[model samples]
Target: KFPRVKNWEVGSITYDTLSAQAQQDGPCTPRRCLGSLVFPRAPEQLLSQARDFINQYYSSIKRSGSQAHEQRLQEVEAEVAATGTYQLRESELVFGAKQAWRNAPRCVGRIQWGKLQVFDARDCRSAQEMFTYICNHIKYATNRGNLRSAITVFPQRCPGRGDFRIWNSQLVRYAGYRQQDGSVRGDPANVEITELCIQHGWTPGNGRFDVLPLLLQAPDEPPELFLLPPELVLEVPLEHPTLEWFAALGLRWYALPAVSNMLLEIGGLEFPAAPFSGWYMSTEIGTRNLCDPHRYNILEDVAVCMDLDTRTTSSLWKDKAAVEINVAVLHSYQLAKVTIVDHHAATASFMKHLENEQKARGGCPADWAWIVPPISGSLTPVFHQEMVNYFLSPAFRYQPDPW
Candidate 1:
């Protein structure tokens, strides 16, 4: 039996036949369902994953049954037999990266997956080399505030050697300072990395929005700190289209969202330092990153500025402030000419992506909770839609912290 997906808004349904191919067990048990839980990985026993990936590549080129495809499969197994692993051809790596993005479940912006710019930094052998590669990626993707999606794939994890890693969660993030009192300055989400940077000899800044330096590790060596060039990092200061006082709040966010920690798995090969990011949806900055209780927690500040009643839930101050914050995010990014999407447009495109995948691959792997934006889960068309989440590769998998 297949999982039936429905779009309650449209009154349409479809059977997800792809879920039947899931190779690993999900958290759901006969007695309980933990579908809402987050976190969702494996090598084939490498031949099968490699073969399937190669078949997929060739299939896309309209040569699935060609002799070149057969010979490539043979070449892969030959390398694996000799060295216990194999390397991907340049084009193959590019294809795999796009497929991984297309396969990601947590991303609401996978509609832009096919357009990611992949930079092959596979030749990187030193921390300095990694820094330059990352800087170039930032410059290229930042593109003078007209951001473009890009990933720089460093050398794949190999045998008889340590792995390359970027210790920061994102290439661009603010430093979090733990104060003498039980208060966090700047983005609390980045406190540990900020401490690590200071411990490693970074001249710490006391400002609220200090950009932390990169801790790049090149195999068997201690992580090194390299401060990002200010010119390469573009930031948009938050300003409401109507509220003149909003700009005085001095809030801002980095233009690029390159996640550096996740491991990229493709054709039984793993690239530990394959940092990828494209753009941001406004709510990611406005509703969640800024307003989440555990994050910057700036909702009360905004509500107070707007002169809203915080004394009662009936006042709807939190909800009002959140919507305006989202508005400011959108307005500021547009004013800065940086690429960003609103949740409404992003979710509508996702519905189209679902239809495209439904025809191309029968079904797409998706996490319903994640697909729905944080600010307005039910207001979007995707909220009422049922989706089946599963592991698909080539894919990006979260690895343990390098510290």
Candidate 2:
């Protein structure tokens, strides 16, 4: 059953309803009003955004101010009004994807935003197809040793069907196993997904850095698991420039850091299965992945190797060990000829990005917490700068896990 309505109002204008729906009786029958807890927006707000996006696209390609552009805009508005949905041309999709990367508030690598290669995989119809697309994305983006930034956009939401999604936060990740002694091995951040893979018949590995298979889901079907070939994944072995024993620790990380779980919103449309990548920023691997207590928790181990006094906090053993570990990561990547940016260089580049964006757009939106590096916050130029953060169209956003 569907709801019946006579008219709807937006601002001072009144219009007849195009469509409305009533909740069908189910396990949770009576409707509970949560009142837009999940960043809800009015239809009018989204319609206005559609116009802005289309106009921006036309202007970028010198088609704006033309009668054709005006006609197209009018047609889009009419479609939105009639069906509560509209379509984007192929050109529009490409431009929107790049702009979304540029407008990403939390990413420090916005300088390379315009160079991102966008792959439109919206026509994919099955989980196996999605897996094939992802494998290609990983291989091309990995590029032997020189990583490239890329994103693959899957199909958007359709009526009566759920959105397509990739279950892993990143395409490449290690398996985490919980032992009988109540200890976790491998990356603890991935324990949940790793267990999900095991339950789905994946052969679990015993090593600390075994790459997990991808769980890809198409609309209205069970997710299918696919293992990435070992050769397609590029990794760097960590070794300090001066510390000979650093190689003994056997720390390593994947070459490319492609985040797959984020949703890419273009205009008013949501792409739930868009995966984007950027080259590694050393601290992300060194500090967060290696030093974080819940993940690797190897600060004391590295400290003991460095002959630091781990018995007391006054020695600042953890801090010293963390710096050395970060240095090792930077050194190893350089030795392997892989693309990696140190914290200082990355922050400096971001400062340049701020200048470019300010000159180009009058202002730049940034999250100070993210722009600042984890290890040395105050030393970086971005640490002192004030940033104004706000919502923008064609933005990369964190979405609730589909699992």
Candidate 3:
């Protein structure tokens, strides 16, 4: 040490600790954590959103600055402040429901959104009544194969009580069975709900297309299960254009895709039990419901039946089989005279929807993942287009499951 050895710590003795201190002092602050994220909007937020909705509604009808508009706004604010809730008039409810469909980002068939028939079922008090309403909705929407887009909205959410809810993802869904060998039969996406139905005293059917019952719930009470009528469900038998063996596959799908579990948010009000539907895009059934690994998983079977070389990825066997399956779906639906949309036509209409929406409201909010067809991504126009997505009021949204 006395020999003045060059310091072993020769690096910067005057090193800037300020940068490190600044990093530690940055925006990361510890706060008490809530166990779960909640979407309950504040009363003030509801009031503001309600006002905006009312203003837009009135303007659309050329009555924006009228005394009636001001009166309704004042009434809504008072109601919201007093009870933390408000009601939409029947006409307003119908309009809002349609607008919600129009504003849905994931739906490719938004072109017909305005044509939706809205059923006001807010007075339904029990599961039995809910079942009746649903049956009626199915019948009317089915229209004996001429399907119509529709929605039936149950009661809105209140402060102290639980909201009315439909526990099924859709009004009609196939049951899934885990076989002895651990392979799934029917729709794997519905396995949990199917088990739930069985537990609730349902007679499980041993078939690939058994329709599950609806689990309807009321506020502060146990959910009750109800079976749908057999004749109300319309299904089409699928066959291919050239392959006669395709008819032997025993494949079929329900005509209507009635989504029952989605929440309808209109001006900060939440209708937790609104069931809506649109006619199927063929690929939704052919490519997704049938070919998806989780569902039927029939790609390999079809490839084998077609005698394609499935041993290599370069063979494009899956693609060839999928195209044939989709073609069969389209052909079968056409042969059965059921309402269905081919992917090309659906995406073209969506592009038209984008143009119409851009002119109507500056921009369109789209979920690109959903907008593009599952089977053909780059082949569709929507796949090539860049979309800007954002939240808008009067929208349909997926909510937490009420199980």
Candidate 4:
């Protein structure tokens, strides 16, 4: 049975047939709704999963049940049975990389998921080689701020071996310096990793926005530190359209959002070090990264500068400050010619995306809490769209920290 979803703004309804294909059970039950749940965090009969994935790949090309499909499935079993695992062909790996992003429930950027630049790094032999591959990934993805979506696939996780891993949550992160007074100087989210890099014999920077070196790990070995060249990182300084004083904040963010810590699963195989990048939505940087209490926490400063009545909840000072900061982020990124999307336009496209997936494959798997932007309320259409979240393969999955 499929779940029925509705858009409260337009009063349209959709039944999700795609939910039927979910690979894992969700936390939701009949008595309680866990729609707002966050970060809720496979393999098996290698043959069946491989079979299903192969079916998906072939069916996608209208080749299912063909002799070629049958032969590939046979090849999959032969390799798995003989060697306990099998490698994916170039074409299937590319398909699965695209499918992984398309199947991601938390991403609001899936509208462009169909096409992704795949960089194969499976033959990588050392930590040094990993750095080179990822450097290429960053250079290609950055593209002078005309960003393109891309993923670099490293070797698959083998059954009896340790997995290769990237210690950084993202390839581009501002180093967090924990001050003596227990406050963080940069991104608090990266404090542990920043400290880890220092402990592993790397020098630390005193500034707030220092780019940390990468800690790349090959199987069964300690992570090696690789300093990223400054030229490879493109950054944009923050400025507001009307607030001339805002530019003096000296706050800036990197142009790329390359996630490096997740595992990429295709069929029954796992790529332990597959790093991927996509363009950031404005609110992700402006609303959450800059304004979240645990992150930069710039709301109070902005509010006081804007001369808002911050003393009272009824003043809506935080709301006003958040909006202006978002405006500044949008304005700055556009001025710098960096690729970014506004939340309003993104959610509208997500609506159209929902309709497309509904017709293409019955239903689209989505996580409501993440699909909705951080700053919008009734202003965005995704706020009113009731969604059903479920798991599907292949997927980008969060793994435990490599430390």
Question: Candidate 3: which pairs clash?
Answer: none
What lDDT score goes with residue 189 in model 1? 95
By TM-score rank, best first, the candidates go 4, 1, 3, 2
- Model 1: residue 337 alpha-carbon error in angstroms: 0.9
Write one digit per residue (lDDT tens) for candidate 1, span 283-356. Answer: 99999899999999999999999999999989999999999999999999998999999999999999999998
Q: Clashing residue pairs, candidate 2?
A: none
Q: What is model 3's C-alpha RMSD?
A: 12.5
User: What stretches of model 1 exceed 4 Å from their correct place?
Assistant: 41-44
lDDT, model 4, position 123: 94
Q: Is candidate 1 or candidate 2 better by lDDT?
A: 1
lDDT of 4 by residue, 150-200 (tens): 999999999777889999999999999998789999898899999999999
Clash count of each predicted structure: 0, 0, 0, 0
Error of 1 at 240 (Å): 1.2
lDDT of 2 by residue, 106-204 (tens): 789888888988899989989999988888998889898788999999998756787798999999899999987878989999999999999988999
* Candidate 3 residue lDDT tens string, 1-403: 1111111222211221112211111122257432122231188888878887898789878898899999999999999878888999998998899788876667899988789898999998888888899999999999998998889999999889888999999998999977878877789999989988889888898899888988999888788988888899999999999999999999989999999988998877889999998799999999999999878999999999999999998999999999999999999988888899999999989978876775676556666778989888777878766654445668877687877
Q: How far is 57's C-alpha from truth in model 3 (Å)?
A: 1.2
lDDT of each: 0.91, 0.82, 0.83, 0.91
lDDT of 2: 0.82
